[PDB]
Each structure stands twice: as structure tokens, then as C-alpha cells.
Design a protein around this ligand. Structure first.
Ligand SMILES: OC[C@H]1NC[C@H](O)[C@@H](O)[C@@H]1O
Ligand SMILES: [Ca+2]
Length: 557
């Protein structure tokens, strides 16, 4: 003692409700579906669930465009269903983390309908309204979802700001009354017993006074420029002081776009801002600036990025660790090898990495099954507004052909992570009895929960066993982290240590046999678990012979 907070040793599971489990045949997942599957998650060993936005929403961005912060999304159920989900999680000693989207609201939110009525409306300053310049928009800000970040509203002739979709106007945190409304809203959910909140694009809350144009340089990486608002930390510290200081909920911020060196300002516990951070340096380590092309990287880049992110946590900060989420391609497809002969092996290898990283691991729904990217055939197979945005910015402008967009976005699209969870091999993998909102991956015939749960050699069983091991081994949670050799592009090896106990994690990222020599003086003591291994090393081993994609966790001496 002091002991570590429950969130530092917990294993979280991210549920994208819309695609988890449908119970009424409309093809959309819902609260009753998630509730019916809590035993599944409890059995896997999950301590807490983070659910994507579940509030009233027109769904132009699947929940991230909120029209009423105190009502549940019609598609997911009623408040009664949300309350029941809460109660069932508690009966199982599980915690719930909800998504908080307060960088912007839906343009259907009552605040916006009011704001847009006139320049003198009491809600005018709840958003950003500005006069155009030189015949066009206020400045050159681009939107993440296509075109300008400024939309003209003829009702007043001014433009309103939207970093994301035109139906997601940005909230004006410079307005005290708006901040107070957001705080009351957070208390509304916190009073219901919510255990955590994940703050969507938490680094963009502060806008730059005067909205000057982005420089040519900033334009190439506008995501970073939007995180440089001068009042950001003041706002975060105020929110902590006014809200979180009065509850025992964990806060996690999605720091997208921010330079890694600034992350400590968000998570250093002494600053009283956020408890932990979701960074994207790793998950986007091979993504081009335009966000739809990929750039070839090696394990050397992968581990060096992890090393830099871990270092940033220092002694008072804390990181979450994830290899996938609802905005990125599937982990095994992105970091592993999803070819049939290597999918399971690499998926287990990635699981070992995830569950042995320093920080709070988040498992995205389906990754415990080894789900893969989807085989998109036409641009119409994508539902995502972001893909429509790339079409607008790159195809309609003649920068790329529709075929080039398809070829590339098929590998990076958010829709890859949004296909229905594959429960079994019944119609539409047991996700729905109706027509799914997004097509189920045809590989559900071999990749599904029912098939993996009863098989000791499945990806699921491996995740389950890793989660047990993590729970029983303190060092694998809060222990220190040290990369054995940052320049090695074949075998990822590192140690986790705490209170004199040290563990070695070794993962072969190559589809070929490789060798690993332990550091001078270090020797294998015991083997906790291995995947794709014919035999464990013998006690005292000073080196290991690795099979393709083999992974293992060992106690060393
Ligand atoms: O809200 C905008 C953007 N924020 C980040 C979320 O992960 C993503 O799904 C959403 O579209
Ligand atoms: Ca439904």
C-alpha cells in the first residue's frame, strides 16, 4: 500500500452496442442484447465494459451526434433497459464506462436549434458562429468528415463550426453557461452509478481565439492543430474540480491528434485532469496523414512507439493499451496476419502483447475471437460517414479514383471493426434474426463464439487464460516495463517487474522460426503460458527457440 486503483489492474472490454447483439430483429444491437451477454463477458474475465455512445441521436455518426444527453438512444432501448444493464453489471461485480461526447452535439440538439435562430438567442454562444471572409468560409479549417469545417446557415448568414460532420456542430467551451450545462449532464449519469467516462476527442475542446488560418504545414496535419487550443487544460481542470472530484469514477480521454509530448498534461495525477489516456500513436503508426492510406512499418517501429508512449506516462500518469477499437481495422488484420493459416496464431500473439502491456488493456469486441477485416467489394458496402468524406475530398476533386479509394479504405476503414459480432453459425452469426445494419463477415462459419468457447485451443480460450494470468500477476498490471531491444524487427521481448518479481514476454512477429537470447544474467525460471509452442523452455534456459508467431510469458531469475 498504497494500493493501485481498481482501474489500473482491470481488463476492459469495449462494446459497440449497434453491432454486439440485436434482440428485436431490426438488425441493430441493443441494450437487452448486451445485458443478455453479460455472463459471456464475465466468463471471459472482463472487469469493466466501455460502451460507445448510447444517447438519443440521429445517428449520422452512429451515436457520436447527440441530440439529447439525458435520453437513451431509441435503437438501444429505454432508460429502463439502461438501468437494467447497470443493475446486471453490478450483480456481477462489473463496472460500466460510458462515452462522453461533448466536443460537439447533433445539429438536432435543442441547444443548436435555438442557437441558430438569431445572433441574440440565449444559446447563440453554445456554438461557434462566425462571419465568412473574402467571400467564403471564416478560415481554411477542414473537417475530418469532408469539406470545410464551416457550414453557412442562411437563417443568420453566419457559418458554424464543425470539426466533424456538418450535423455535429462544435460546442463552445469558452461559454461558462455551456460548460455548466455539460457538468450538470455529467452529474446526471454519474448519479446513476456510472463507473467511468471516456471523453471523445478530449483534446479539441479549446478553439483558437480569432480562428486564424492554418499554415500550409498545419494543414497537412490539421488534427494536431485542433488540439492546441489555449484554454484546454483550464477547461479539463475545471471539469475535474466541478464534477469528478465529487465522484469515484475513472476518466479516460481520447487524446486524438495531440503530440505525444503533451500527453502528460492530461494524465499526470497531480494535475487533476484525466486518469488515463487513449493515445493513437500506436494504432495509427502505419497510417498516412490523409488517414486512408497505409505506410509499411516494421516491429521496430511498433515497439519503439510503444516505448515512447509508455515513457510518457512517467510516475504519475497512466495509459490504456489497445490494438483495436471501433474506428480502426481489426487487430489481427492490422498488426497480425489474418491469412487462414496464421490468423489464430497471430491473434494469440497479439493477445499476449495486449494483456502484458503496462497500462489498462481494452479488448475490442470480437478480437477475443480473432475476428478480421471485412471483404468490402464496392464503396456502397461502407456505411461510415468518414468514407463518404474521403470520397468528397479525394474522388470528387479528382485526386484519386473511386477504385483507389476502395482499395485503400478497405484496409483502414472504421467499418472493418463494426461488422456484427459473430456469436455462432446460425443466420447472420446469431447477431440478429433480421437483416443486419452492416453485413456480417462470411468467415463467421469458422470464427464465432459458440465454436471457440468449448475449444481449449481457440483464440477465445487463450484470451481467457491470459486474462486470468494477468489478474493473478501484479507485475503484469502495474509492474514496470522495459523493452529488451528496440531495434529488433523480428521478436518483441520485454520484461515486467514489481517487488522483486520479473516476467519476460517474448513474441515472434515473423511467420518463420526465430531465436531469442535472454539478457546477460537472465534465465528462465518458469513458463506461465505460450501460444504456438511445441514445448516450454527448461528451467534455467538462457535462450529460446521460437516457432512462427509464437508468444509466451515467463517468470525469470
Ligand atoms: O465524434 C467524432 C469521432 N470522435 C472519436 C470517435 O472514436 C469516433 O467514432 C467519432 O466519429
Ligand atoms: Ca435491436
Amino acid at each position: 500500500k498504497p494500493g493501485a486503483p481498481w482501474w489500473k489492474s482491470a481488463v476492459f472490454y469495449q462494446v459497440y452496442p449497434r453491432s454486439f447483439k440485436d434482440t428485436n430483429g431490426d438488425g441493430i444491437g441493443d441494450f437487452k442484447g448486451l445485458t443478455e451477454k453479460l455472463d459471456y463477458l464475465k466468463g471471459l474475465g472482463i472487469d469493466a465494459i466501455w460502451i460507445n455512445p448510447h444517447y438519443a441521436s440521429p445517428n449520422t455518426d452512429n451515436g457520436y451526434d447527440i441530440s439529447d444527453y439525458r435520453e437513451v438512444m431509441k435503437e438501444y432501448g429505454t432508460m429502463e433497459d439502461f438501468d437494467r444493464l447497470m443493475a446486471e453489471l453490478k450483480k456481477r461485480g462489473m463496472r460500466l464506462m460510458v462515452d462522453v461526447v461533448i466536443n460537439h452535439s447533433s445539429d438536432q440538439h435543442e441547444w443548436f436549434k435555438s442557437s441558430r435562430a438569431s445572433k441574440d438567442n440565449p444559446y447563440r454562444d453554445y456554438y461557434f458562429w462566425r462571419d465568412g471572409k473574402d467571400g467564403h468560409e471564416p478560415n481554411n479549417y477542414p473537417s475530418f468528415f469532408g469539406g470545410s469545417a464551416w457550414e453557412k446557415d442562411p437563417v443568420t448568414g453566419q457559418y458554424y463550426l464543425h470539426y466533424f460532420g456538418r450535423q455535429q456542430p462544435d460546442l463552445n467551451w469558452d461559454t461558462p453557461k455551456l460548460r455548466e450545462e455539460l457538468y450538470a449532464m455529467l452529474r446526471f449519469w454519474l448519479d446513476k452509478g456510472v463507473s467511468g467516462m471516456r471523453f471523445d476527442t478530449v483534446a479539441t475542446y479549446s478553439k483558437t481565439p480569432g480562428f486564424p488560418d492554418l499554415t500550409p504545414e498545419q494543414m497537412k496535419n490539421f488534427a494536431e492543430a485542433y488540439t492546441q487550443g489555449p484554454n484546454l487544460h483550464r477547461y479539463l481542470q475545471e471539469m475535474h474540480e466541478k464534477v469528478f472530484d465529487h465522484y469515484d469514477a475513472v476518466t479516460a480521454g481520447e487524446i486524438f491528434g495531440a503530440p505525444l509530448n503533451q500527453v502528460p498534461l492530461f494524465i499526470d495525477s497531480r494535475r487533476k485532469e484525466l486518469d488515463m489516456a487513449f493515445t493513437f500513436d500506436l494504432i495509427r503508426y502505419d497510417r498516412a496523414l490523409d488517414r486512408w492510406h497505409t505506410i509499411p512499418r516494421t516491429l521496430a517501429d511498433f515497439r519503439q512507439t510503444i516505448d515512447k508512449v509508455d515513457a510518457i506516462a512517467g510516475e504519475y500518469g497512466w495509459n490504456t493499451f489497445f490494438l483495436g477499437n471501433h474506428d480502426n481495422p481489426r487487430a489481427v488484420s492490422h498488426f497480425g496476419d489474418d491469412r487462414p493459416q496464421w490468423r489464430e496464431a497471430s491473434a494469440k500473439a497479439l493477445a499476449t502483447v495486449t494483456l502484458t502491456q503496462r497500462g489498462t488493456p481494452f479488448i475490442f469486441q470480437g478480437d477475443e475471437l480473432g475476428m478480421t477485416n471485412y471483404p468490402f467489394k464496392t464503396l456502397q458496402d461502407f456505411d461510415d460517414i468518414e468514407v463518404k468524406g474521403f470520397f468528397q475530398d479525394y474522388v470528387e476533386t479528382g485526386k484519386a479514383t473511386a477504385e483507389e479509394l476502395l482499395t485503400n479504405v478497405a484496409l483502414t476503414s472504421r467499418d472493418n471493426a463494426r461488422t456484427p459480432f459473430q456469436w455462432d453459425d446460425s443466420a447472420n452469426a446469431g447477431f440478429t434474426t433480421g437483416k443486419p445494419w452492416l453485413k456480417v463477415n462470411p468467415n463467421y462459419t469458422e470464427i464465432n463464439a459458440a465454436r471457440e468457447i468449448g475449444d481449449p485451443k481457440s483464440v477465445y480460450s487463450f484470451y481467457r487464460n491470459l486474462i486470468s494470468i494477468r489478474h493473478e500477476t501484479p507485475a503484469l498490471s502495474t509492474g514496470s516495463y522495459r523493452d529488451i531491444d528496440p531495434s529488433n524487427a523480428d521478436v518483441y521481448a520485454y520484461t515486467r517487474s514489481q517487488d522483486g518479481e520479473t516476467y519476460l514476454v517474448v513474441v515472434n512477429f515473423k511467420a518463420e522460426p526465430r531465436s531469442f537470447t535472454l539478457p546477460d544474467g537472465m534465465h528462465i525460471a518458469e513458463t506461465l503460458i505460450e501460444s504456438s509452442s511445441p514445448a516450454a523452455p527448461a528451467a534455467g534456459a538462457a535462450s529460446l527457440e521460437l516457432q512462427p508467431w509464437q508468444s509466451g510469458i515467463y517468470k525469470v531469475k
